[PDB]
Structure 1
Amino acid sequence: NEDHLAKELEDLNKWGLNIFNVAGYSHNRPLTCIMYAIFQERDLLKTFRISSDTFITYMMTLEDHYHSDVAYHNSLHAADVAQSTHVLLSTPALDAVFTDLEILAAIFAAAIHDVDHPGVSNQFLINTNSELALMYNDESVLENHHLAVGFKLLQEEHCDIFMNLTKKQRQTLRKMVIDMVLATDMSKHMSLLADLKTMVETKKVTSSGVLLLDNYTDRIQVLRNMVHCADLSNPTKSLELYRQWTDRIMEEFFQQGDKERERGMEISPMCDKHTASVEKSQVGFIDYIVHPLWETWADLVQPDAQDILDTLEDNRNWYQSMI
């Protein structure tokens, strides 16, 4: 078991680590497991002077604030998105571009980015006049909530993993984490992608092939898109993995739709189990959102995302063939 887990973790730095297996061999604590592994691997506990006690206490509490009864937005998704962010941060075209603080912020953002998710969409919370929707004026409702919960937990006993950052580092990491978690709001996707496209149209590259990211706005725009890419990375994974993720998301979609029906609401796109095509939905989603995003990302970091994009396109065609 320890041996099995260690074996899965050989793939820690690789796209398509099998996080499902990690969850199995870590007694269903994939977020705590993978975060500890990532922080050990990048030396973040040492660099930011975080004790293992404090770190594991925060991560255990964080993971406990993901809902195990929600089919997709649970701690396995968080873990997967944290591990994918960790891989993307090490893309060659981005070597030496980001600071230790930016790396910390990205992985932390990815870890907390869906904490306390109820398993329904922002539109559902809005259309049902949720307390959260009211709190945040219908604006990035769940994403504002994830941030509020992920940060509040840092104030629990033995949980402040940022205690030994400098004041300015703490302030800057909070802003960057906010930015990256808000970037997982699908409402911001088109503007994120437009900015990424600009990034690409005007990219500055060294002789070695590494991207030149002068100002802070350039860096955070890449980091936002990076976390958004990691959040939408399921279709770019090996088909056996992606299919597992699809099963989960449709289960979650069908539950929301059942809630909408029982409340006499109009059922949301892809949430009516009696009429939904899982395959058609995935293809549409890849065509309209995921592929344009990842193709632009691939352009930014060319050729580093060649296999990812090839996998995306192959999975797209496979699902389309299953319609």
Structure 2
Amino acid sequence: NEDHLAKELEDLNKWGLNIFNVAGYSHNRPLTCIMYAIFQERDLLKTFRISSDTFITYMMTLEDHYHSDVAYHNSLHAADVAQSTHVLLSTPALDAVFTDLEILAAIFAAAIHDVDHPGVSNQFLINTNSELALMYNDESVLENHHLAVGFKLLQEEHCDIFMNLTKKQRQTLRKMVIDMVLATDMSKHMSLLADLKTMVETKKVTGVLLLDNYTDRIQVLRNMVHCADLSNPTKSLELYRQWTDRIMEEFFQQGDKERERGMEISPMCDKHTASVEKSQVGFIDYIVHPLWETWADLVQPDAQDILDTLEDNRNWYQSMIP
């Protein structure tokens, strides 16, 4: 259970990495593990002078703030999203486009984007008057929280992995990370899809994309991490079904919490009524495919592989409904 880990890590730069396998061969530290692997592969610890033991201790601690008892939003998902972002950042069509600071930001954001997630939605927290909804005034409650926890763990010197960055670089990195994580709030999905469509319709090239200013670059990065977040169904069917099983256990866990309390249960989180299979088809047709077809458009043909699989998996789930 150490050579197996290195064998699985050869696919670090591939969509086909199996994060459940690395979780198993890493003594259940998939996020610490994958984040160290990625930072080395990109020479980020050297480029930004991050001490290796500082990095390990931060990551072990960030990972410890992902809850083991939530089915989906644990450190396995942060790891999956970080690694998925790492791959999209290498898409040939975006080759030389982002600074190393922008690259650092995207990967760090992916790693923290769901830290301390309680396993319930923004809507539940708001309708139960939770302390978190009061803190954040019902706006992007969880996403604001995830950013707060992530940045709060940097406050201590033994853990400030951004210590040797310029003062200006910490401000831009912080502005960028805030922007990317807030962009994972699913109630911003349509707003993000619309803007991504506008950039496809006005795209320049060389065959590498032209992004004139910051507003363009961070708008791609927001959509990248959102795509990474919502990339489960574009993975090979074996992985996608494990993710489907996790997310649905979590959602049914929440509908049970809604039933215990007499509030109305949303059809999709109802374990007595809801079809797992039909809800995945709907999830794909109305959210995931519209988004990944557009991302595919922006980077074509780099993402055509992902789009075929997405479509294949979609058809597999459709033909599992009676």
TM-score, normalised to structure 2, is 0.99
- The unaligned stretches of length 5 or more in structure 1 are none
Name the residue aligned to 1:151. Answer: 151
- The unaligned stretches of length 5 or more in structure 2 are none
Name the residue aligned to 2:302. Answer: 304
* 2:106/2:225 contact within 8 Å kept: yes
CA–CA separation in structure 1 for the residues paired with 2:149 and 2:293: 33
The offset of 1:157, in angstroms, is 4.7
* 2:116/2:146 contact within 8 Å kept: yes
Q: Helix, strand or coil: the match of 1:165? A: coil
CA–CA separation in structure 2 for the residues paired with 1:272 and 1:251: 11
Name the residue aligned to 1:320. Answer: 318
1:228-270 CA distance string (max 9 Å, x none)? 0000000000000000000000000010000000001111231
CA–CA separation in structure 1 for the residues paired with 2:47 and 2:216: 25
1:129-173 CA distance string (max 9 Å, x none)? 111111111111100000000000011351100000101100000
The offset of 1:47, in angstroms, is 0.3
* 2:200/2:297 contact within 8 Å kept: yes
CA–CA separation in structure 1 for the residues paired with 2:157 and 2:128: 35
CA–CA separation in structure 1 for the residues paired with 2:32 and 2:158: 15
Aligned length: 321
Report the more deviating stretch, 261-270 or 67-76.
261-270
The offset of 1:194, in angstroms, is 0.6
Name the residue aligned to 2:288. Answer: 290
CA–CA separation in structure 2 for the residues paired with 1:82 and 1:156: 23
Structure 1 stretches of 4+ moved >2 Å: none
CA–CA separation in structure 2 for the residues paired with 1:102 and 1:262: 45
* 2:133/2:141 contact within 8 Å kept: yes
* 2:296/2:302 contact within 8 Å kept: yes
Report the more deviating stretch, 228-237 or 152-161.
152-161
* 2:71 is the alignment partner of 1:71: yes
1:213-235 CA distance string (max 9 Å, x none)? 11100000000000000000000
* 2:267/2:273 contact within 8 Å kept: no
TM-score, normalised to structure 1, is 0.99
Q: Alpha carbon RMSD of aligned pairs, Å?
A: 0.6
Percentage of matched positions with identical amino acids: 100
CA–CA separation in structure 2 for the residues paired with 1:312 and 1:137: 36
